[PDB]
Symmetry: D2
Subunit: 116 residues, 4 copies
């Protein structure tokens, strides 16, 4: 599990449950190719998106579908989604945790990068 996503809800003070996440990887023709997807669990975490073999060097985009999350709770938010774009594994394999904190008109995102 070299890529994990955590999401928290700043209005409720709780994990953000059932948040859809789509990961893309930039292809040779400079388009975003679908790479992996999933949803956050009751703990707000999304595990098992990829494997060490599959998660090669590249530029990755982690799209967090924040609008669908808020609308399912009856709230009209500002952003369409949160996009996190980064180069991965350029100095060898690393483990990446993408963390996000959500409010209807604001969000924060952090990266925790560790070396196995």
């Amino acid at each position: 599990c070299p890529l994990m996503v955590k999401v928290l809800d700043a209005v409720r003070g709780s994990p953000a449950i059932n948040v859809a996440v789509h990961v893309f990887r930039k292809a040779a023709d400079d388009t975003w190719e679908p790479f992996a997807s999933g949803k956050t669990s009751e703990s707000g975490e999304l595990h098992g998106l990829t494997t060490e073999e599959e998660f090669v060097e590249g530029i990755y985009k982690v799209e967090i579908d924040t609008k669908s999350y808020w609308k399912a709770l009856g709230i009209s938010p500002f952003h369409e989604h949160a996009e996190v774009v980064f180069t991965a594994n350029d100095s060898g394999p690393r483990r990446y945790t993408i963390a996000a904190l959500l409010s209807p008109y604001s969000y924060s995102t952090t990266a925790v990068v560790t070396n196995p």
Copy 2:
């Protein structure tokens, strides 16, 4: 004025209006002494808290009454207030902007220090 406070509301995407703000200065006996206070304007800003003459080096605390703000909007908050504690240091001319972004169970605060 060398000290200004700005407060934003992350739930409504708006300035945080009519928020009470209290500034304290640390006295020699280690207690917090009232220094200045006010309420944020329609733009979420509080100007005119102090003057360069009065804002000497020392430790200051800015207390933002976030609980009352959320209660007035019918929203149940977590924190009693937001506290920002910092040292004022002289080191050339200095303007201090204390910014805060409020959510019911979260807040962020930033210091913008400019010449």
Copy 3:
């Protein structure tokens, strides 16, 4: 101007100066079309991006070139850039301020929408 961008630096406690910002509008064929761009000023702000005539309802993306900013300061960043994607909706007069607070491995963004 109905759209403004503000960028702050959380490491130095200062405006983020000379940061490139690109705005795109979603076209009918689902691609991102260049719409406006500029560089943040000494106050970290980018004004005059568009006009009320041109800023019609639709989906917009604001791209902040954070990687170049940190590299110019000798700091190694994580993100390629910061992207802010939102729908502009009419619903009375509307000013949009897109604010961003930058750290090397983190960023926050807020929308302040005022009448």
Copy 4:
């Protein structure tokens, strides 16, 4: 473990290690009485501050010694510390996670509150 503290470093993209944390509780005379203290581990987490029996109703202050953290890394930060003040257990026992994200001139704090 009804009270836990997590701290992340936004400059390094890593847990904030060896951050001192002091917890206080408002006493009957309206002073802050020392309640518990500890330091974050290599994971950035501080466990074992208190017990269900000890952690009664009250107003609590969690002081995170951010200045000492940055100065130990050779950085001159803005804030003296981060203070998180809240009423706890007013509707019965809850579990509280205080999370913080640190930059030299900025910090964010969130609360995750769950019911056992």
